[PDB]
Amino acid sequence: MTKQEKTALNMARFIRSQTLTLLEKLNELDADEQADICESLHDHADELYRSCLARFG
Amino acid sequence: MTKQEKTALNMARFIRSQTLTLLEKLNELDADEQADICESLHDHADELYRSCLARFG
């Protein structure tokens, strides 16, 4: 229903944000293997936010 | 250890936590197509944390 569907969409949104913010942090630290994995993680996080926005938006 | 390295690790752990909570909540909402992407996302969140734990913790 609306409140738990909305909060599922809001969790997918802040996870997409957090993968950008952690990629920036990994990049300042010079941690290049981890920064690649986090860039890719941000690709998956995007696809899930789009999927959740399509269903619950 | 740098403080910043620990900020990176805690956030990689958070994303690990939340893609999993969101995965279970998407299964509770019977949202199959979204639960499929979130399981793959959580897997990579888990992978990023293992990598960052080895390097920063």
Side-chain angles (χ1 to χ4, degrees), chain A residues 1 4-5 8-9 11-12 14-15 18-19 21-22 25-26 29 31-34 37-38 40-41 44-45 47-48 51-52 55-56, chain B residues 2 4-5 7-8 11-12 14-15 18-19 21-22 25-26 29 31-34 37-38 40-41 44-45 47-48 51-52 55-56:
Chain A
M1 297 161 294
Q4 33 283 300
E5 286 172 12
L9 171 65
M11 274 191 269
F14 80 60
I15 293 172
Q18 288 296 91
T19 51
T21 306
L22 182 66
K25 293 183 187 295
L26 257 26
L29 261 11
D32 295 326
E33 185 196 11
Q34 293 73 206
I37 302 174
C38 198
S40 178
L41 187 63
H44 294 40
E47 183 190 338
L48 177 68
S51 184
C52 288
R55 198 182 188 111
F56 311 127
Chain B
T2 302
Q4 292 78 247
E5 293 174 328
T7 292
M11 196 174 280
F14 185 53
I15 294 170
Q18 299 306 304
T19 48
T21 297
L22 178 58
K25 286 189 184 292
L26 289 170
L29 287 170
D32 296 84
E33 195 239 65
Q34 289 63 38
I37 302 169
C38 200
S40 174
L41 171 62
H44 291 99
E47 292 163 22
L48 176 59
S51 186
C52 291
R55 191 180 178 131
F56 296 138

Short mmCIF file of all heavy atoms in Angstrom, two decimals, chain A residues 1 4-5 8-9 11-12 14-15 18-19 21-22 25-26 29-34 37-38 40-41 44-45 47-48 51-52 55-56, chain B residues 2 4-5 7-8 11-12 14-15 18-19 21-22 25-26 29-34 37-38 40-41 44-45 47-48 51-52 55-56, unseen atoms left out:
data_model
loop_
_atom_site.label_atom_id
_atom_site.label_comp_id
_atom_site.label_asym_id
_atom_site.label_seq_id
_atom_site.Cartn_x
_atom_site.Cartn_y
_atom_site.Cartn_z
N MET A 1 0.82 -1.20 0.00
CA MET A 1 0.00 0.00 0.00
C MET A 1 0.86 1.26 0.00
O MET A 1 2.07 1.16 0.21
CB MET A 1 -0.91 -0.04 1.22
CG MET A 1 -1.89 -1.21 1.20
SD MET A 1 -2.57 -1.57 2.84
CE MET A 1 -1.07 -2.12 3.62
N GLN A 4 4.13 2.04 2.65
CA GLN A 4 5.26 1.13 2.47
C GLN A 4 5.80 1.03 1.05
O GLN A 4 6.95 0.63 0.84
CB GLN A 4 4.95 -0.31 2.96
CG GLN A 4 3.56 -0.93 2.86
CD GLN A 4 2.60 -0.41 3.93
OE1 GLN A 4 2.83 -0.55 5.13
NE2 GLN A 4 1.51 0.23 3.52
N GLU A 5 4.98 1.41 0.07
CA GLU A 5 5.41 1.49 -1.31
C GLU A 5 6.19 2.76 -1.56
O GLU A 5 7.09 2.80 -2.40
CB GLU A 5 4.25 1.50 -2.26
CG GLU A 5 3.60 0.15 -2.37
CD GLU A 5 2.30 0.11 -3.15
OE1 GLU A 5 1.94 1.08 -3.83
OE2 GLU A 5 1.64 -0.92 -3.06
N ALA A 8 9.58 2.30 0.17
CA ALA A 8 10.44 1.41 -0.60
C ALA A 8 11.11 2.21 -1.72
O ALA A 8 12.30 2.06 -1.99
CB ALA A 8 9.63 0.28 -1.22
N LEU A 9 10.34 3.10 -2.35
CA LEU A 9 10.85 4.00 -3.39
C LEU A 9 11.86 4.97 -2.79
O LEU A 9 12.87 5.26 -3.43
CB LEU A 9 9.70 4.77 -4.02
CG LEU A 9 9.99 5.93 -4.97
CD1 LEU A 9 10.67 5.41 -6.21
CD2 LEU A 9 8.70 6.64 -5.31
N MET A 11 13.81 4.45 -0.16
CA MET A 11 15.00 3.70 0.16
C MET A 11 15.83 3.48 -1.09
O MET A 11 17.04 3.68 -1.05
CB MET A 11 14.66 2.35 0.76
CG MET A 11 14.43 2.42 2.26
SD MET A 11 14.34 0.80 3.08
CE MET A 11 12.59 0.71 2.88
N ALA A 12 15.21 3.14 -2.21
CA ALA A 12 15.91 3.00 -3.49
C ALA A 12 16.57 4.29 -4.01
O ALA A 12 17.55 4.26 -4.75
CB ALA A 12 14.92 2.50 -4.54
N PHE A 14 17.67 6.97 -1.82
CA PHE A 14 18.81 7.32 -0.99
C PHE A 14 19.94 6.33 -1.22
O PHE A 14 21.08 6.74 -1.06
CB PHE A 14 18.42 7.41 0.53
CG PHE A 14 18.27 6.19 1.46
CD1 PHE A 14 19.34 5.30 1.71
CD2 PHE A 14 17.06 5.99 2.12
CE1 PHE A 14 19.18 4.24 2.61
CE2 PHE A 14 16.91 4.93 3.02
CZ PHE A 14 17.97 4.05 3.27
N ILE A 15 19.69 5.06 -1.58
CA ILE A 15 20.76 4.13 -1.91
C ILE A 15 21.47 4.57 -3.19
O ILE A 15 22.70 4.50 -3.27
CB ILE A 15 20.18 2.70 -2.05
CG1 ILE A 15 19.68 2.22 -0.69
CG2 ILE A 15 21.27 1.74 -2.57
CD1 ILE A 15 18.89 0.90 -0.73
N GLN A 18 23.66 7.41 -2.06
CA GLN A 18 24.75 6.94 -1.24
C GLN A 18 25.87 6.29 -2.02
O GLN A 18 27.01 6.29 -1.58
CB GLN A 18 24.24 5.93 -0.20
CG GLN A 18 23.40 6.49 0.96
CD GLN A 18 24.17 7.44 1.86
OE1 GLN A 18 24.19 8.64 1.65
NE2 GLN A 18 24.83 6.91 2.88
N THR A 19 25.54 5.71 -3.18
CA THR A 19 26.55 5.11 -4.03
C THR A 19 27.33 6.18 -4.79
O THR A 19 28.49 5.95 -5.11
CB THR A 19 25.93 4.11 -5.04
OG1 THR A 19 24.86 4.74 -5.72
CG2 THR A 19 25.49 2.84 -4.34
N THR A 21 27.85 9.28 -3.37
CA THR A 21 28.58 9.87 -2.24
C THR A 21 29.71 8.98 -1.76
O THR A 21 30.77 9.49 -1.40
CB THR A 21 27.60 10.17 -1.08
OG1 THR A 21 26.57 10.97 -1.64
CG2 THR A 21 28.19 10.99 0.06
N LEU A 22 29.53 7.65 -1.78
CA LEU A 22 30.61 6.75 -1.42
C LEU A 22 31.60 6.61 -2.57
O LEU A 22 32.78 6.35 -2.32
CB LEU A 22 30.08 5.36 -1.05
CG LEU A 22 31.11 4.32 -0.60
CD1 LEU A 22 31.74 4.70 0.72
CD2 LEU A 22 30.43 2.99 -0.42
N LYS A 25 33.91 9.54 -2.15
CA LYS A 25 34.77 9.31 -0.99
C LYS A 25 35.87 8.30 -1.27
O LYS A 25 37.00 8.48 -0.83
CB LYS A 25 33.95 8.80 0.19
CG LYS A 25 32.98 9.82 0.75
CD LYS A 25 32.30 9.19 1.95
CE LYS A 25 31.19 10.09 2.46
NZ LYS A 25 31.71 11.35 2.99
N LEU A 26 35.54 7.24 -2.01
CA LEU A 26 36.50 6.23 -2.41
C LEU A 26 37.52 6.84 -3.36
O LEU A 26 38.72 6.59 -3.22
CB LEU A 26 35.74 5.09 -3.08
CG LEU A 26 35.48 3.77 -2.34
CD1 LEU A 26 35.45 3.93 -0.82
CD2 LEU A 26 34.16 3.23 -2.86
N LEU A 29 40.02 9.00 -1.39
CA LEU A 29 40.94 8.09 -0.74
C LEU A 29 41.90 7.41 -1.72
O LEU A 29 42.87 6.80 -1.27
CB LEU A 29 40.15 7.04 0.02
CG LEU A 29 39.87 7.09 1.53
CD1 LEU A 29 40.23 8.42 2.17
CD2 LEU A 29 38.40 6.77 1.71
N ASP A 30 41.69 7.49 -3.04
CA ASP A 30 42.57 6.86 -4.02
C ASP A 30 42.31 5.36 -4.16
O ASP A 30 43.05 4.66 -4.85
N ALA A 31 41.26 4.83 -3.51
CA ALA A 31 40.91 3.42 -3.53
C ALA A 31 40.23 3.05 -4.85
O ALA A 31 39.01 3.04 -4.97
CB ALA A 31 39.98 3.14 -2.34
N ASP A 32 41.07 2.74 -5.84
CA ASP A 32 40.60 2.54 -7.21
C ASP A 32 39.86 1.26 -7.56
O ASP A 32 38.99 1.29 -8.44
CB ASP A 32 41.80 2.70 -8.16
CG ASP A 32 42.41 4.10 -8.20
OD1 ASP A 32 41.70 5.10 -8.07
OD2 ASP A 32 43.62 4.18 -8.36
N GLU A 33 40.17 0.13 -6.92
CA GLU A 33 39.42 -1.09 -7.16
C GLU A 33 38.00 -0.95 -6.58
O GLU A 33 37.02 -1.35 -7.21
CB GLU A 33 40.12 -2.26 -6.50
CG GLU A 33 39.37 -3.53 -6.90
CD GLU A 33 39.63 -4.80 -6.09
OE1 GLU A 33 40.26 -4.73 -5.03
OE2 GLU A 33 39.18 -5.85 -6.54
N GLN A 34 37.91 -0.35 -5.38
CA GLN A 34 36.65 -0.15 -4.70
C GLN A 34 35.79 0.89 -5.41
O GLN A 34 34.57 0.78 -5.45
CB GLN A 34 36.90 0.29 -3.25
CG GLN A 34 37.54 -0.70 -2.28
CD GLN A 34 39.03 -1.00 -2.44
OE1 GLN A 34 39.49 -2.08 -2.06
NE2 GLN A 34 39.87 -0.11 -2.99
N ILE A 37 34.00 -0.79 -8.42
CA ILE A 37 32.88 -1.59 -7.93
C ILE A 37 31.73 -0.68 -7.50
O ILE A 37 30.56 -1.04 -7.67
CB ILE A 37 33.36 -2.48 -6.73
CG1 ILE A 37 34.52 -3.39 -7.13
CG2 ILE A 37 32.18 -3.34 -6.25
CD1 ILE A 37 35.15 -4.19 -5.98
N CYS A 38 32.02 0.52 -6.96
CA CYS A 38 30.98 1.42 -6.51
C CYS A 38 30.34 2.16 -7.68
O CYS A 38 29.17 2.52 -7.61
CB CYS A 38 31.56 2.41 -5.54
SG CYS A 38 30.26 3.21 -4.57
N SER A 40 29.93 0.75 -10.66
CA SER A 40 29.05 -0.30 -11.15
C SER A 40 27.84 -0.49 -10.24
O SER A 40 26.73 -0.72 -10.73
CB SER A 40 29.85 -1.58 -11.24
OG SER A 40 29.01 -2.63 -11.68
N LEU A 41 28.05 -0.36 -8.92
CA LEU A 41 26.97 -0.47 -7.94
C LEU A 41 25.97 0.66 -8.16
O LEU A 41 24.76 0.47 -8.05
CB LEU A 41 27.53 -0.40 -6.51
CG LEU A 41 26.57 -0.66 -5.34
CD1 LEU A 41 26.05 -2.05 -5.44
CD2 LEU A 41 27.27 -0.54 -4.01
N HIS A 44 23.61 -0.31 -10.95
CA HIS A 44 22.52 -1.18 -10.50
C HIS A 44 21.49 -0.43 -9.66
O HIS A 44 20.28 -0.62 -9.82
CB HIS A 44 23.11 -2.36 -9.71
CG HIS A 44 23.97 -3.29 -10.57
ND1 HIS A 44 24.83 -2.98 -11.54
CD2 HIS A 44 23.96 -4.66 -10.46
CE1 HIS A 44 25.34 -4.08 -12.02
NE2 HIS A 44 24.81 -5.09 -11.36
N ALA A 45 21.97 0.47 -8.80
CA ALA A 45 21.14 1.30 -7.94
C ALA A 45 20.21 2.21 -8.73
O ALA A 45 19.07 2.43 -8.33
CB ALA A 45 22.02 2.16 -7.04
N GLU A 47 19.13 1.48 -11.93
CA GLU A 47 18.16 0.60 -12.54
C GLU A 47 17.05 0.22 -11.57
O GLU A 47 15.88 0.16 -11.97
CB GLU A 47 18.90 -0.64 -13.04
CG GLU A 47 18.09 -1.70 -13.81
CD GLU A 47 18.82 -3.03 -14.10
OE1 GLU A 47 20.05 -3.07 -14.10
OE2 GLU A 47 18.14 -4.03 -14.32
N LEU A 48 17.38 -0.01 -10.28
CA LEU A 48 16.35 -0.30 -9.28
C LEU A 48 15.52 0.95 -8.96
O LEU A 48 14.31 0.81 -8.80
CB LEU A 48 16.99 -0.82 -7.99
CG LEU A 48 16.01 -1.11 -6.83
CD1 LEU A 48 15.13 -2.28 -7.20
CD2 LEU A 48 16.77 -1.38 -5.55
N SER A 51 13.06 1.29 -11.74
CA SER A 51 12.09 0.21 -11.62
C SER A 51 11.05 0.48 -10.53
O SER A 51 9.86 0.27 -10.74
CB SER A 51 12.85 -1.06 -11.31
OG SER A 51 12.03 -2.20 -11.26
N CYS A 52 11.50 0.98 -9.37
CA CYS A 52 10.63 1.32 -8.25
C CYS A 52 9.80 2.55 -8.55
O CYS A 52 8.66 2.65 -8.13
CB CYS A 52 11.43 1.62 -7.00
SG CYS A 52 12.17 0.14 -6.27
N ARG A 55 6.88 1.50 -10.74
CA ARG A 55 5.82 0.77 -10.07
C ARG A 55 5.06 1.54 -8.99
O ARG A 55 3.85 1.38 -8.83
CB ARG A 55 6.42 -0.49 -9.47
CG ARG A 55 5.34 -1.52 -9.13
CD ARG A 55 5.95 -2.74 -8.48
NE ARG A 55 4.96 -3.79 -8.34
CZ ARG A 55 5.03 -4.92 -9.06
NH1 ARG A 55 6.00 -5.16 -9.95
NH2 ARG A 55 4.09 -5.83 -8.87
N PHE A 56 5.79 2.38 -8.24
CA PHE A 56 5.26 3.05 -7.07
C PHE A 56 5.19 4.57 -7.18
O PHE A 56 4.69 5.22 -6.27
CB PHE A 56 6.12 2.73 -5.85
CG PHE A 56 6.42 1.26 -5.62
CD1 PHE A 56 7.75 0.87 -5.45
CD2 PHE A 56 5.39 0.32 -5.57
CE1 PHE A 56 8.04 -0.48 -5.23
CE2 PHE A 56 5.69 -1.03 -5.35
CZ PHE A 56 7.02 -1.43 -5.18
N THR B 2 42.75 7.19 9.54
CA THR B 2 42.40 8.34 8.71
C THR B 2 41.07 9.01 9.05
O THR B 2 40.96 10.21 8.79
CB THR B 2 42.44 7.90 7.21
OG1 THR B 2 43.76 7.42 7.03
CG2 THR B 2 42.20 8.97 6.16
N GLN B 4 38.37 9.21 7.67
CA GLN B 4 37.75 9.20 6.37
C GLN B 4 37.63 7.78 5.82
O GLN B 4 36.62 7.45 5.20
CB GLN B 4 38.57 10.04 5.39
CG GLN B 4 38.63 11.55 5.59
CD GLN B 4 39.56 12.04 6.69
OE1 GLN B 4 39.13 12.58 7.71
NE2 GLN B 4 40.87 11.90 6.52
N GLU B 5 38.65 6.92 6.02
CA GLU B 5 38.59 5.52 5.61
C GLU B 5 37.47 4.79 6.32
O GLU B 5 36.82 3.90 5.76
CB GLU B 5 39.86 4.78 5.93
CG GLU B 5 41.07 5.22 5.14
CD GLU B 5 42.39 4.58 5.57
OE1 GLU B 5 42.58 4.28 6.75
OE2 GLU B 5 43.26 4.40 4.72
N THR B 7 34.72 6.31 7.53
CA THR B 7 33.48 6.88 6.99
C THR B 7 33.09 6.13 5.73
O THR B 7 31.92 5.80 5.53
CB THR B 7 33.69 8.40 6.70
OG1 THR B 7 33.84 8.98 7.99
CG2 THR B 7 32.56 9.13 5.99
N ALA B 8 34.09 5.81 4.89
CA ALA B 8 33.88 5.04 3.68
C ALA B 8 33.35 3.65 3.98
O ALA B 8 32.35 3.23 3.40
CB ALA B 8 35.19 4.89 2.91
N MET B 11 29.68 3.54 5.42
CA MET B 11 28.72 3.81 4.36
C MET B 11 28.58 2.63 3.42
O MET B 11 27.46 2.35 2.97
CB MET B 11 29.14 5.02 3.58
CG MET B 11 27.97 5.52 2.77
SD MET B 11 28.35 7.07 1.95
CE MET B 11 28.12 8.19 3.30
N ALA B 12 29.68 1.92 3.11
CA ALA B 12 29.61 0.71 2.30
C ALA B 12 28.79 -0.35 3.04
O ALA B 12 28.01 -1.08 2.44
CB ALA B 12 31.02 0.17 2.04
N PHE B 14 26.39 0.38 5.32
CA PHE B 14 25.02 0.87 5.32
C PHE B 14 24.31 0.45 4.05
O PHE B 14 23.21 -0.09 4.14
CB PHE B 14 25.01 2.39 5.42
CG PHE B 14 23.63 3.01 5.54
CD1 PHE B 14 22.73 2.57 6.53
CD2 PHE B 14 23.27 4.05 4.68
CE1 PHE B 14 21.48 3.18 6.65
CE2 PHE B 14 22.02 4.65 4.81
CZ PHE B 14 21.12 4.23 5.79
N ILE B 15 24.94 0.63 2.88
CA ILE B 15 24.31 0.29 1.60
C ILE B 15 24.06 -1.21 1.56
O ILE B 15 22.99 -1.64 1.11
CB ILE B 15 25.24 0.74 0.43
CG1 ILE B 15 25.32 2.27 0.43
CG2 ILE B 15 24.72 0.25 -0.92
CD1 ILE B 15 26.39 2.84 -0.51
N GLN B 18 20.87 -1.76 3.73
CA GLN B 18 19.67 -1.20 3.15
C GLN B 18 19.17 -1.79 1.86
O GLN B 18 17.97 -1.74 1.60
CB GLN B 18 19.89 0.30 2.95
CG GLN B 18 20.16 0.99 4.27
CD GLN B 18 19.12 0.75 5.35
OE1 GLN B 18 17.93 1.00 5.19
NE2 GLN B 18 19.58 0.25 6.50
N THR B 19 20.06 -2.32 1.01
CA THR B 19 19.64 -2.98 -0.22
C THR B 19 18.99 -4.32 0.13
O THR B 19 18.09 -4.78 -0.57
CB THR B 19 20.86 -3.18 -1.15
OG1 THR B 19 21.91 -3.74 -0.38
CG2 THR B 19 21.38 -1.89 -1.73
N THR B 21 17.37 -4.78 3.29
CA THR B 21 16.09 -4.44 3.91
C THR B 21 15.07 -4.13 2.81
O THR B 21 13.95 -4.62 2.84
CB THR B 21 16.20 -3.20 4.86
OG1 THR B 21 17.08 -3.56 5.92
CG2 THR B 21 14.87 -2.82 5.49
N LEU B 22 15.51 -3.36 1.82
CA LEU B 22 14.68 -3.02 0.68
C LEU B 22 14.34 -4.28 -0.11
O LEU B 22 13.19 -4.41 -0.52
CB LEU B 22 15.43 -2.03 -0.18
CG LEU B 22 14.80 -1.54 -1.47
CD1 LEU B 22 13.44 -0.90 -1.20
CD2 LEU B 22 15.77 -0.59 -2.14
N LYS B 25 11.59 -6.01 1.75
CA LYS B 25 10.38 -5.22 1.65
C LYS B 25 9.72 -5.24 0.28
O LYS B 25 8.50 -5.13 0.17
CB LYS B 25 10.66 -3.77 2.01
CG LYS B 25 10.85 -3.61 3.50
CD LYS B 25 10.91 -2.13 3.80
CE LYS B 25 11.19 -1.89 5.27
NZ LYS B 25 10.08 -2.31 6.09
N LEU B 26 10.53 -5.42 -0.77
CA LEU B 26 10.02 -5.54 -2.13
C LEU B 26 9.40 -6.91 -2.29
O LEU B 26 8.42 -7.04 -3.02
CB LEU B 26 11.15 -5.36 -3.15
CG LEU B 26 11.69 -3.92 -3.30
CD1 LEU B 26 12.96 -3.96 -4.14
CD2 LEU B 26 10.63 -3.01 -3.90
N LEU B 29 5.99 -6.68 -0.73
CA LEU B 29 5.10 -5.97 -1.63
C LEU B 29 4.79 -6.75 -2.90
O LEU B 29 4.14 -6.24 -3.82
CB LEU B 29 5.72 -4.64 -2.01
CG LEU B 29 5.77 -3.54 -0.97
CD1 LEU B 29 6.65 -2.42 -1.49
CD2 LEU B 29 4.36 -3.06 -0.64
N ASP B 30 5.30 -7.99 -3.00
CA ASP B 30 5.10 -8.86 -4.15
C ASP B 30 5.53 -8.23 -5.47
O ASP B 30 4.94 -8.49 -6.51
N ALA B 31 6.53 -7.36 -5.39
CA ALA B 31 7.07 -6.65 -6.53
C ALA B 31 8.26 -7.40 -7.12
O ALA B 31 9.41 -7.01 -6.94
CB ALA B 31 7.46 -5.25 -6.06
N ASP B 32 7.97 -8.49 -7.83
CA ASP B 32 8.95 -9.40 -8.44
C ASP B 32 10.07 -8.84 -9.31
O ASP B 32 11.24 -9.18 -9.15
CB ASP B 32 8.25 -10.46 -9.29
CG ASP B 32 7.35 -11.37 -8.48
OD1 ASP B 32 6.20 -11.00 -8.23
OD2 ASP B 32 7.81 -12.46 -8.12
N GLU B 33 9.70 -8.00 -10.27
CA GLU B 33 10.65 -7.40 -11.19
C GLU B 33 11.64 -6.47 -10.48
O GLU B 33 12.80 -6.38 -10.89
CB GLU B 33 9.85 -6.68 -12.26
CG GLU B 33 10.64 -6.31 -13.50
CD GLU B 33 10.66 -4.82 -13.80
OE1 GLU B 33 11.21 -4.06 -13.00
OE2 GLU B 33 10.14 -4.41 -14.84
N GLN B 34 11.18 -5.80 -9.40
CA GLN B 34 11.98 -4.90 -8.59
C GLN B 34 12.82 -5.67 -7.58
O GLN B 34 13.96 -5.31 -7.30
CB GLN B 34 11.11 -3.91 -7.81
CG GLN B 34 10.38 -2.82 -8.57
CD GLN B 34 9.36 -3.28 -9.59
OE1 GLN B 34 8.62 -4.25 -9.40
NE2 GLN B 34 9.28 -2.61 -10.73
N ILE B 37 15.99 -6.99 -9.39
CA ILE B 37 17.08 -6.03 -9.57
C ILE B 37 17.71 -5.76 -8.21
O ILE B 37 18.93 -5.80 -8.10
CB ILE B 37 16.56 -4.69 -10.20
CG1 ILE B 37 15.89 -4.95 -11.54
CG2 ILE B 37 17.72 -3.76 -10.45
CD1 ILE B 37 15.13 -3.72 -12.07
N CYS B 38 16.92 -5.56 -7.15
CA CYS B 38 17.45 -5.30 -5.83
C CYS B 38 18.28 -6.44 -5.29
O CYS B 38 19.23 -6.17 -4.57
CB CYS B 38 16.34 -5.03 -4.84
SG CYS B 38 16.99 -4.17 -3.39
N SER B 40 20.27 -8.45 -7.11
CA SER B 40 21.53 -8.25 -7.80
C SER B 40 22.28 -7.04 -7.25
O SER B 40 23.48 -7.11 -7.04
CB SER B 40 21.27 -8.04 -9.28
OG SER B 40 22.46 -7.70 -9.97
N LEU B 41 21.57 -5.94 -6.95
CA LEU B 41 22.16 -4.76 -6.35
C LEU B 41 22.76 -5.14 -5.00
O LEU B 41 23.96 -4.98 -4.85
CB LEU B 41 21.09 -3.66 -6.17
CG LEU B 41 21.47 -2.41 -5.37
CD1 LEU B 41 22.61 -1.68 -6.05
CD2 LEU B 41 20.30 -1.47 -5.26
N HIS B 44 26.14 -6.90 -5.08
CA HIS B 44 27.26 -6.02 -5.36
C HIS B 44 27.56 -5.07 -4.19
O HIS B 44 28.68 -4.63 -4.00
CB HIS B 44 26.94 -5.26 -6.67
CG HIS B 44 26.97 -6.19 -7.89
ND1 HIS B 44 25.95 -6.77 -8.52
CD2 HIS B 44 28.12 -6.62 -8.51
CE1 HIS B 44 26.43 -7.54 -9.47
NE2 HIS B 44 27.74 -7.44 -9.45
N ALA B 45 26.55 -4.76 -3.37
CA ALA B 45 26.71 -3.96 -2.16
C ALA B 45 27.53 -4.75 -1.15
O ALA B 45 28.40 -4.23 -0.45
CB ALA B 45 25.36 -3.65 -1.56
N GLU B 47 29.52 -7.32 -2.06
CA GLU B 47 30.85 -7.40 -2.62
C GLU B 47 31.69 -6.15 -2.33
O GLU B 47 32.86 -6.28 -1.94
CB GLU B 47 30.73 -7.59 -4.10
CG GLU B 47 30.16 -8.95 -4.45
CD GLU B 47 29.62 -9.07 -5.87
OE1 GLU B 47 30.03 -8.28 -6.72
OE2 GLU B 47 28.79 -9.95 -6.11
N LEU B 48 31.11 -4.94 -2.46
CA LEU B 48 31.82 -3.69 -2.18
C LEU B 48 32.24 -3.56 -0.73
O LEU B 48 33.32 -3.05 -0.45
CB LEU B 48 30.97 -2.47 -2.53
CG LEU B 48 31.56 -1.10 -2.21
CD1 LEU B 48 32.88 -0.88 -2.95
CD2 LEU B 48 30.54 -0.05 -2.58
N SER B 51 35.37 -5.97 0.08
CA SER B 51 36.52 -5.27 -0.48
C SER B 51 36.97 -4.08 0.39
O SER B 51 38.14 -3.98 0.76
CB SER B 51 36.11 -4.84 -1.89
OG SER B 51 37.13 -4.26 -2.69
N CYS B 52 36.04 -3.18 0.76
CA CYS B 52 36.33 -2.03 1.61
C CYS B 52 36.67 -2.43 3.05
O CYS B 52 37.40 -1.71 3.71
CB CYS B 52 35.16 -1.06 1.72
SG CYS B 52 34.75 -0.11 0.24
N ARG B 55 40.37 -3.53 3.02
CA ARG B 55 41.23 -2.37 2.85
C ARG B 55 41.19 -1.32 3.95
O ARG B 55 42.22 -0.70 4.22
CB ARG B 55 40.90 -1.65 1.52
CG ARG B 55 41.96 -0.60 1.17
CD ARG B 55 41.72 0.17 -0.12
NE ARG B 55 42.76 1.16 -0.29
CZ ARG B 55 43.44 1.31 -1.44
NH1 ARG B 55 43.19 0.55 -2.50
NH2 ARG B 55 44.37 2.25 -1.52
N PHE B 56 40.07 -1.09 4.63
CA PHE B 56 39.96 0.01 5.57
C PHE B 56 39.81 -0.32 7.04
O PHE B 56 40.18 0.48 7.90
CB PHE B 56 38.79 0.90 5.18
CG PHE B 56 38.96 1.57 3.83
CD1 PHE B 56 37.86 1.63 2.96
CD2 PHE B 56 40.19 2.15 3.48
CE1 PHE B 56 38.01 2.28 1.73
CE2 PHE B 56 40.32 2.79 2.25
CZ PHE B 56 39.23 2.85 1.38
#
